[PDB]
Amino acid sequence: SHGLFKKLGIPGPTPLPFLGNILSYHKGFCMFDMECHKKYGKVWGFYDGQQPVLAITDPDMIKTVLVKECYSVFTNRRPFGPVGFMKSAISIAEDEEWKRLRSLLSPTFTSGKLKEMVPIIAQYGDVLVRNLRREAETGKPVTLKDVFGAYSMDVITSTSFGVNIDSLDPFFLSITVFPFLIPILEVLNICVFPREVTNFLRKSVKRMDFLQLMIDALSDLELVAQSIIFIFAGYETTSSVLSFIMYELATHPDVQQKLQEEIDAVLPNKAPPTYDTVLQMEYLDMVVNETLRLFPIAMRLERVCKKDVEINGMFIPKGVVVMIPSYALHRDPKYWTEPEKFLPERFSKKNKDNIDPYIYTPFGSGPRNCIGMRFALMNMKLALIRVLQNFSFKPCKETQIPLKLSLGGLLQPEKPVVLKVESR
Amino acid sequence: SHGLFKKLGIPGPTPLPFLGNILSYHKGFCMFDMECHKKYGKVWGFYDGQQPVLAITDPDMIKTVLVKECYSVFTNRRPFGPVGFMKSAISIAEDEEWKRLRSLLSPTFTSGKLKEMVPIIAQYGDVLVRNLRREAETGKPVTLKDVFGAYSMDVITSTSFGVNIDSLDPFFLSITVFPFLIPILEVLNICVFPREVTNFLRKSVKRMDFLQLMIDALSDLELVAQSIIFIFAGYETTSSVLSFIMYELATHPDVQQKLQEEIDAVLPNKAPPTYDTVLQMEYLDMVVNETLRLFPIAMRLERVCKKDVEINGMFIPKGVVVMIPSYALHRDPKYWTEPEKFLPERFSKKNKDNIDPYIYTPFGSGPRNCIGMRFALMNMKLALIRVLQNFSFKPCKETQIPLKLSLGGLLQPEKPVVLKVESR
Ligand code: HEM
Ligand code: HEM
Ligand SMILES: O=C(CNC(=O)C(F)(F)F)N[C@H](CS[C@H](Cc1ccccc1)C(=O)NCCCc1cccnc1)Cc1ccccc1
Ligand SMILES: O=C(CNC(=O)C(F)(F)F)N[C@H](CS[C@H](Cc1ccccc1)C(=O)NCCCc1cccnc1)Cc1ccccc1
Numbered sequence: 001s002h003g004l005f006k007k008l009g010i011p012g013p014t015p016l017p018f019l020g021n022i023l024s025y026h027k028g029f030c031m032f033d034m035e036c037h038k039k040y041g042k043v044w045g046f047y048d049g050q051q052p053v054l055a056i057t058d059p060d061m062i063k064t065v066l067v068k069e070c071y072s073v074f075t076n077r078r079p080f081g082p083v084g085f086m087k088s089a090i091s092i093a094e095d096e097e098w099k100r101l102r103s104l105l106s107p108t109f110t111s112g113k114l115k116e117m118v119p120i121i122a123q124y125g126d127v128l129v130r131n132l133r134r135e136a137e138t139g140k141p142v143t144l145k146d147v148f149g150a151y152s153m154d155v156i157t158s159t160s161f162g163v164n165i166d167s168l169d170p171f172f173l174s175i176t177v178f179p180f181l182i183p184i185l186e187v188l189n190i191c192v193f194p195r196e197v198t199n200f201l202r203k204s205v206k207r208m209d210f211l212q213l214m215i216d217a218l219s220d221l222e223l224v225a226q227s228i229i230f231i232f233a234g235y236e237t238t239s240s241v242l243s244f245i246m247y248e249l250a251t252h253p254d255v256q257q258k259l260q261e262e263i264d265a266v267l268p269n270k271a272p273p274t275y276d277t278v279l280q281m282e283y284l285d286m287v288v289n290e291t292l293r294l295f296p297i298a299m300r301l302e303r304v305c306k307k308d309v310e311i312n313g314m315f316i317p318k319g320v321v322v323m324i325p326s327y328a329l330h331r332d333p334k335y336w337t338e339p340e341k342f343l344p345e346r347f348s349k350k351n352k353d354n355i356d357p358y359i360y361t362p363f364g365s366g367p368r369n370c371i372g373m374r375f376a377l378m379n380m381k382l383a384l385i386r387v388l389q390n391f392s393f394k395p396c397k398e399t400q401i402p403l404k405l406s407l408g409g410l411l412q413p414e415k416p417v418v419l420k421v422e423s424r
Numbered sequence: 425s426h427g428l429f430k431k432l433g434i435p436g437p438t439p440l441p442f443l444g445n446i447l448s449y450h451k452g453f454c455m456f457d458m459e460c461h462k463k464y465g466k467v468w469g470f471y472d473g474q475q476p477v478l479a480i481t482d483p484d485m486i487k488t489v490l491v492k493e494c495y496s497v498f499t500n501r502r503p504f505g506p507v508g509f510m511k512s513a514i515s516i517a518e519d520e521e522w523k524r525l526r527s528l529l530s531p532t533f534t535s536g537k538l539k540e541m542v543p544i545i546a547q548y549g550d551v552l553v554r555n556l557r558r559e560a561e562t563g564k565p566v567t568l569k570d571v572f573g574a575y576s577m578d579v580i581t582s583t584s585f586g587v588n589i590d591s592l593d594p595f596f597l598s599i600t601v602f603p604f605l606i607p608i609l610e611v612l613n614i615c616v617f618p619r620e621v622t623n624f625l626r627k628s629v630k631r632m633d634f635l636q637l638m639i640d641a642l643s644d645l646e647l648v649a650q651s652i653i654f655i656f657a658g659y660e661t662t663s664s665v666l667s668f669i670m671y672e673l674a675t676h677p678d679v680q681q682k683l684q685e686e687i688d689a690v691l692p693n694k695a696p697p698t699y700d701t702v703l704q705m706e707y708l709d710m711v712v713n714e715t716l717r718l719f720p721i722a723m724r725l726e727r728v729c730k731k732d733v734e735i736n737g738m739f740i741p742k743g744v745v746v747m748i749p750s751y752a753l754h755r756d757p758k759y760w761t762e763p764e765k766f767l768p769e770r771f772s773k774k775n776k777d778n779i780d781p782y783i784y785t786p787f788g789s790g791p792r793n794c795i796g797m798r799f800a801l802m803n804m805k806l807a808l809i810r811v812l813q814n815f816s817f818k819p820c821k822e823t824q825i826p827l828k829l830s831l832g833g834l835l836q837p838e839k840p841v842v843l844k845v846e847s848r
Contacts, residue, residue, distance in 0.1 A: 050611065095731070096731055096732065096742075097742070179607070180607030180608045180610060180611050181607075181608070183603070183604030183605075183607070184604045184605070184608065186604060187474065187604050307519070307520055308520065318520075318521070
C-alpha cells in the first residue's frame with residue numbers, strides 16, 4: 001500500500017514503513033504543506049501511516065472536489081475515532097446520515113435567525129466591556145483569549161440554549177499509525193473526548209434557539225452530540241480568531257486606528273451595533289478576512305474519495321484522502337504579493353475581485369462548508385465593535401513579536417496573546 | 425448497540441454482553457436457524473458479537489433483498505477478514521469493485537463456453553472410473569470425497585488453466601466478538617488463508633480458459649485472487665455435493681436404480697455424455713436438486729444493508745446484516761411435506777411448479793447469485809453419469825446412518841462418507 005503514488009506517477013516525499021510520512025510533521029501541519037507545495041507543485045501525495053493522502057492546489061480541481069463532486073464522490077471527511085456517540089455529530093457523520101442533519105440544522109443561521117440574536121448578543125458585550133474595564137484601569141497586561149473565551153462561551157450558551165452566566169499530539173499520533181486500532185477503542189467506550197467532559201454536558205439542560213429548532217427525524221442522545229459541536233465551535237473558534245485579530249491590530253496601529261475611525265463613523269456617539277450597521281462596515285470585514293487569510297484555524301480541508309474517479313485530468317482511486325492545504329494556499333506568493341505581511345487592503349472592493357474563492361477558503365466551500373460561517377463573522381464583529389469602541393491595544397513587554405504558531409492541533413499561538421489595553 | 429432489535433420491535437433471543445448470541449451456535453449455524461424460525465416466525469434478529477443480524481423468511485422480502493434492491497441497498501456481503509490481497513476476490517469485493525469483476529468474469533460460463541468443456545471434462549471421468557475400478561474389484565469400502573475431490577481438482581485445474589494431472593471454529597470465532605480486530609491483523613499480513621498456501625498458488629502458472637478470458641480493466645495479483653476462489657469452489661463444492669448424493673443414492677436404492685435406468689436409456693450402450701444429453705435427463709436433475717434441498721452447502725445468504733430502508737413494510741437500519749436461512753427454509757414443514765426425507769419427486773415437472781424460487785435458493789438469487797451455478801450442475805452431472813453407468817453403491821458396515829451434519833463451517837458430514845461399491 002506504500003507504492004500507490006509511485007504507481008500513479010504522483011510526486012511526493014518517500015514514505016517510511018508503518019510511519020508513512022508522519023515524521024515530517026515535526027514543524028507542524030503547515031510548514032509541511034508549505035514545503036511540499038514548493039518541492040512538488042500543483043499536486044503531491046503522502047501517507048498518514050498507511051493512509052494515502054493526495055494534496056491538490058488546482059483551483060478547478062479544488063472547486064470540483066468541494067462543490068461539483070461533493071454529493072457523489074467527496075461527501076465525507078477522514079474517519080475520526082474513537083468517538084462513541086459523537087459519530088452522529090454533524091461534522092463527523094457520513095453520507096446520508098449527514099444529509100439529514102445538515103438540512104435539519106440549516107435554518108438556524110438564516111439572516112433572520114441571526115438578526116434575532118443581535119439583541120441578545122448585545123448584553124454580554126457590555127459584560128465583556130466591563131470585564132475589560134477592570135483590567136485596564138489597572139495597567140495589567142491582559143490575556144485576550146481568556147476574556148474573549150469567557151465572552152465566546154457566554155454567547156454560545158445563550159445563542160443556542162438560553163442560560164445566562166457571567167463567565168468570570170499525545171495519542172492521536174498513535175491513531176495515524178494505528179487506524180486499525182480505532183474500532184478497538186470503539187468497543188472500550190474509549191473517547192478522544194474524556195468521558196467525564198461528555199457525562200457533564202450530558203446535563204440534558206432541555207426544559208419543559210438552536211435547542212428549540214431541534215425538538216421542533218431527530219433523536220435525543222444525538223441532540224447532545226450536536227450541542228457539543230456548537231458549544232465548542234462557537235467558543236474556541238471565536239476566541240482564537242478574536243485573539244489573532246487583536247495581536248495584528250496592535251502590531252499594525254495604523255490599521256487599528258483606521259478601523260476605529262470607521263466604527264465611530266458608522267456608529268456615532270458610541271452607538272449600539274445592529275445587524276444592518278455591521279454589514280456596512282467594510283474595513284472591518286477586510287480586517288477579519290485578512291486575519292483569516294493569515295490564520296485559517298482549520299489549516300486543512302479533507303474529503304474521503306468514496307469511489308474511483310478522474311477529475312480535471314487526474315485519476316484518483318477509491319479510499320484516498322483528498323486534501324486542500326488552506327494554510328499553504330493563503331501564503332503562496334504565486335497568488336499573494338509579500339504573503340507574510342498583514343495587508344487588509346487585499347480585501348478592498350478595488351482589490352477583492354482579484355482573489356479566487358478556491359484559494360481563499362477560511363470556511364471551506366460547497367455543501368459541507370462551515371455551517372456557522374455567517375454567525376461567526378457576526379458574533380466576532382459585534383465583539384470587535386464594542387471592544388474597539390472603547391479601548392486601544394498596544395504591544396506589551398512580554399508580547400510575542402513575531403508570533404510563533406503552535407504545532408499541529410489547531411492554528412493556535414505558542415505563547416498566549418498578551419497586550420496592553422488603554423481606555424479612550 | 426444491543427437494543428436495536430428491542431427498539432425496532434423485532435423479536436429475537438436475548439443477547440449476552442460482548443458475545444451477542446454466539447453461544448447459541450453450539451448446535452451449528454443450522455439448528456440455530458431452524459430453532460429461531462420456530463420460536464419467532466417470519467422475521468427475527470440476533471447479534472454476532474456486536475453485529476446485528478436480521479433474519480427474514482418472507483419470499484417477497486427475500487426477492488426484494490436479493491433482486492429488487494441489490495444494486496442500491498444490498499450489494500455486498502458481511503466483511504470477511506483478515507484477507508490481504510483476497511479483498512479483491514469477487515466473492516469478497518464490495519460495491520463498484522465487484523460490479524467490474526462480475527462483468528469481466530461473466531462470459532466464462534456461457535452455454536457455449538461450457539459446451540466447449542464437455543470434451544475436456546470427458547477425460548478425467550475415465551480417470552475417475554479407472555480409479556474407482558481399482559478399489560471396487562477389491563471389496564474395500566471407499567472414501568467418496570477423496571476420489572471425487574481428486575476428480576474435482578482435476579477438472580478445475582484444466583477447465584480454467586489447462587494443467588493435466590492424475591490426482592492420485594478455531595479463531596474465526598474470536599473475529600465475531602472481535603471484528604474491531606480485523607484491520608489489526610490486516611496490517612500484520614495475517615490471513616485466514618495461511619500465507620504458505622497462497623505463496624504456493626502464487627505460482628503465476630500463466631504461460632507465454634478462465635485463465636485465458638482474463639488476460640484477454642484487470643490486474644495481475646488480483647488475477648491470482650480470482651483463481652483461488654475458482655479452484656476452491658470447483659473443487660470442494662463439487663466433491664462435497666457428490667458425496668452427499670452418493671450417500672442418498674445408497675440409502676434409497678430405488679432412486680439409485682431408477683436413475684441408472686434413465687442414464688442407460690438416454691445414453692444406450694454406455695454412451696458418452698454430451699452437453700445436450702445431460703440437459704435431457706430430468707430424473708438426474710431432480711436427484712441433484714433434492715440433494716441440494718437437504719444439503720445447501722452455503723447454509724445461509726447474507727447482505728450488508730448499506731443505507732436506511734423500508735422493504736415490504738419493515739424498516740431496516742444502515743449496517744444491519746440481512747440474512748436468509750437457506751437451510752431452515754429448505755426444511756420448513758410450512759412449505760415441504762415431511763421435510764426430512766429424501767424425496768426427489770418434489771422436483772418433477774408435475775410438482776416442480778409448487779416451489780418458490782425464494783424458498784429454494786441453493787445458489788442464491790439476483791445479480792450476486794452463484795456465478796458458477798450452471799458449471800457446477802454440469803460438472804457434477806457428468807460425474808454422476810460416468811460413475812453410475814458402471815457401479816452401484818450400497819451402505820457399508822461403517823457407513824454413518826443417519827448421517828450427522830458437522831458443526832458450522834460448511835455443510836459437511838461429521839464422519840466421512842464411506843460406501844460399498846459394486847461393478848455392473
Ligand atoms: C472563525 C470562525 C470559524 C471558522 C474560520 C470556521 C471554519 C470552518 C471550516 C474550514 C470548516 C470545514 C469546511 C469544509 O470542510 O469544507 C468548518 C466546518 C464546520 N463548522 Fe466552522 N468555522 C468557524 C466557526 C464555526 C462556528 C461558530 C460554528 C457554530 C456551530 C461552526 C460549525 C461548523 C460545523 C458544524 C462544521 C461542519 C459542517 C459539516 O461538515 O457539514 N463553525 N468550519
Ligand atoms: C454445488 C455447487 C455450488 C453451490 C451449491 C454454490 C452455491 C453458492 C451460493 C449459495 C452462493 C451465494 C449466492 C448469494 O449470495 O446470493 C455462491 C456464490 C458464488 N459461487 Fe457458488 N456454488 C457452487 C459451486 C460453485 C463453483 C463450481 C464455482 C466456480 C467458480 C462457484 C463460484 C461462486 C462465486 C464466485 C460466488 C460469489 C459470486 C458473487 O458474489 O458475485 N460456485 N455459490
Ligand atoms: O479535527 C479534525 C482533524 N483530523 C484528524 O485526523 C486529527 F487527528 F488531527 F484530529 N477533523 C474534524 C472532525 S472531528 C472534531 C471533534 C471535536 C472536537 C472538539 C469538540 C467537539 C468535537 C470536530 O468535530 N471538529 C469541528 C467542530 C467545531 C468547529 C471547529 C472549527 C471550525 N468549525 C467548527 C473536521 C473539521 C476540521 C476543521 C474545521 C471544521 C471541521
Ligand atoms: O464464508 C463466508 C462466511 N462468513 C463468515 O463470517 C464466517 F466466519 F463464517 F466465515 N462467506 C463468503 C465470503 S469469504 C470465503 C473465503 C475463501 C474460502 C476458501 C477459499 C477461498 C476463499 C469465500 O470466498 N467463499 C466463496 C468461494 C467459493 C464458493 C463456495 C461455495 C459456493 N460458491 C463458491 C461468501 C460465500 C458463502 C457461501 C457461498 C458462496 C460465497
